[PDB]
């Protein structure tokens, strides 16, 4: 397969010599120009999955922070992913923290970043997503692919809820689901919104603004929800792994009380302090070193919520084996980020095949039968 082969060489070269932020922006640009490879294969019917009435053609998507501004949605999806989470976006554009702000360690397959929500802002990203949605209805390869939107707050915003409401009113119509980001480590005081009291008020406000989209509209649903589901976006919350047991219990109760549609487990961590090349660096850590921590977090929340809240897995997923660990722990779907950095354009094709072979040799009829089996 020549196209993937050439890109693997170029990506390995880029890893060794070129700055990480430069690399990421380079490949986003190549995707914008539509010169990345395609995965046009039919996905196994036995690896499809869902979160409530939200259907995924396969269980692998791209996590938030990868295409922050929705400039590259088509090409990333056509690598073989069933969905992508754009953002995190904020109402106003931000430059983020000072460069350099992302570093990679190849041997440990780990990353550390201190971006601080650099993004073009809700208005510009909304225009980008609208353009995608128009392209989607004329491209055979984009049908049934899901696009979620991660939302957060500007660095100097004091009322997070005011920022979340603004983003929902601008972009909610074009999103299949909304991810509430209260777990970034690179914006001071954001994670404090995971406290049960603050979190509950945030979720209810978010759900209220989404419900208010449908009200005061004269068109049929088919023209209000310009997304993939043609329904109002589901609501997820992304949690950080840096919490004590009691905090995790209180959060679990809030999710059940508010009837949230799902939880993303998890964001980056600050606990990792054994990566030599990162010892002087600032930010949250991604990649392999995060896998075990995040998989445990999945098991815990699956228990604390009594299996009632669907889970989106994020953290150190590189192989089909890694994916099955997340699924057997309680996850319904998996998100990749670091895998794309170190494995390149073949990440989706490769990991989908590995998971299919593993579901068979493990004696599963389909993916859904494996959800939560470890417990
Ligand atoms: C450079 C970078 C930027 C990220 N930006 C976001 C973001 O904007 N919003 C978010 O919810 N998570 C963000 N993340 C976290 C990832 O979405 C993901 O949850 C985390 O990296 C763990 O996945 P992984 O181990 O497969 O990389 C970012 C991660 C990295 C490395
Ligand atoms: C070599 C490399 C790539 C990369 N980012 C990638 C990888 C894969 C992509 C596929 C499609 C579109 C954009 C992509 C961006 N990063 N990121 C942070 N360091 C780093 N190093
Ligand atoms: C370097 C390899 C070139 C890849 C060509 C782009 C493939 N595609 C699917 C966009 O046509
Ligand atoms: O924008 C960032 O710096 C960022 C956000 C986030 O949610 N997670 C992360 O690791 N970095």
Curated annotation (Swiss-Prot):
The active site is at residue 184. Its main location: mitochondrion. It is a single-pass membrane protein. GO terms for cellular component: mitochondrial inner membrane. It catalyses: (S)-dihydroorotate + a quinone = orotate + a quinol. Its cofactor is FMN. It is found in: Mitochondrion inner membrane. Substrate binds at residues 68, 113-117, 181, 186, 267-268. One of its GO terms (molecular function) is dihydroorotate dehydrogenase activity. Binds 1 FMN per subunit. Keywords: Flavoprotein, FMN, Membrane, Mitochondrion, Mitochondrion inner membrane, Oxidoreductase, Pyrimidine biosynthesis, Transit peptide, Transmembrane, Transmembrane helix. Monomer. Belongs to the dihydroorotate dehydrogenase family. Type 2 subfamily. This is Dihydroorotate dehydrogenase (quinone), mitochondrial. The chain holds residues 162 to 566 of 569 of the full protein.
């Amino acid at each position: 397969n020549p196209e993937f082969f050439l890109y693997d060489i170029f990506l390995k070269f880029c890893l060794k010599y070129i700055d990480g932020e430069i690399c990421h922006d380079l490949f986003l640009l190549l995707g914008k120009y539509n010169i990345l490879p395609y995965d046009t294969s039919n996905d196994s019917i036995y690896a499809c999955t869902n979160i409530k009435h939200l259907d995924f053609i396969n269980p692998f998507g791209v996590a938030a922070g990868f295409d922050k501004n929705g400039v590259c949605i088509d090409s990333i999806l056509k690598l073989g992913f069933s969905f992508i989470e754009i953002g995190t976006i904020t109402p106003r554009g931000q430059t983020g923290n000072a460069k350099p702000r992302i570093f990679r360690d190849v041997e440990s397959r780990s990353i550390i970043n201190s971006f601080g929500f650099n993004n073009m802002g809700c208005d510009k990203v909304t225009e980008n997503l609208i353009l995608f949605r128009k392209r989607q209805e004329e491209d055979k390869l984009l049908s049934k692919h899901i696009v979620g939107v991660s939302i957060g707050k500007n660095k100097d915003t004091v009322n997070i809820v005011d920022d979340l409401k603004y983003c929902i009113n601008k972009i909610g119509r074009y999103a299949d689901y909304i991810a509430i980001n209260v777990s970034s480590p690179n914006t001071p005081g954001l994670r404090d919104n995971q406290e049960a009291g603050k979190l509950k008020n945030i979720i209810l406000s978010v759900k209220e603004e989404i419900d208010n989209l449908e009200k005061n509209n004269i068109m049929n649903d088919e023209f209000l929800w310009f997304n993939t589901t043609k329904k109002k976006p589901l609501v997820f919350v992304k949690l950080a792994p840096d919490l004590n047991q009691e905090q995790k219990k209180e959060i679990a109760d809030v999710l059940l009380e508010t009837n949230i549609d799902g939880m993303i487990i998890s964001n980056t961590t600050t606990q990792i302090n054994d990566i030599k090349s990162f010892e002087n660096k600032k930010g949250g850590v991604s990649g392999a070193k995060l896998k075990d921590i995040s998989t445990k977090f999945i098991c815990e929340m699956y228990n604390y919520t009594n299996k009632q809240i669907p889970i989106i897995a994020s953290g150190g997923i590189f192989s089909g084996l890694d994916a099955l660990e997340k699924i057997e722990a309680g996850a319904s779907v998996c998100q990749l980020y670091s895998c794309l950095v170190f494995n390149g354009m073949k990440s989706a094709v490769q990991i989908k095949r590995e998971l299919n072979h593993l579901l068979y040799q493990r004696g599963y009829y389909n993916l859904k039968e494996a959800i939560g089996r470890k417990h």
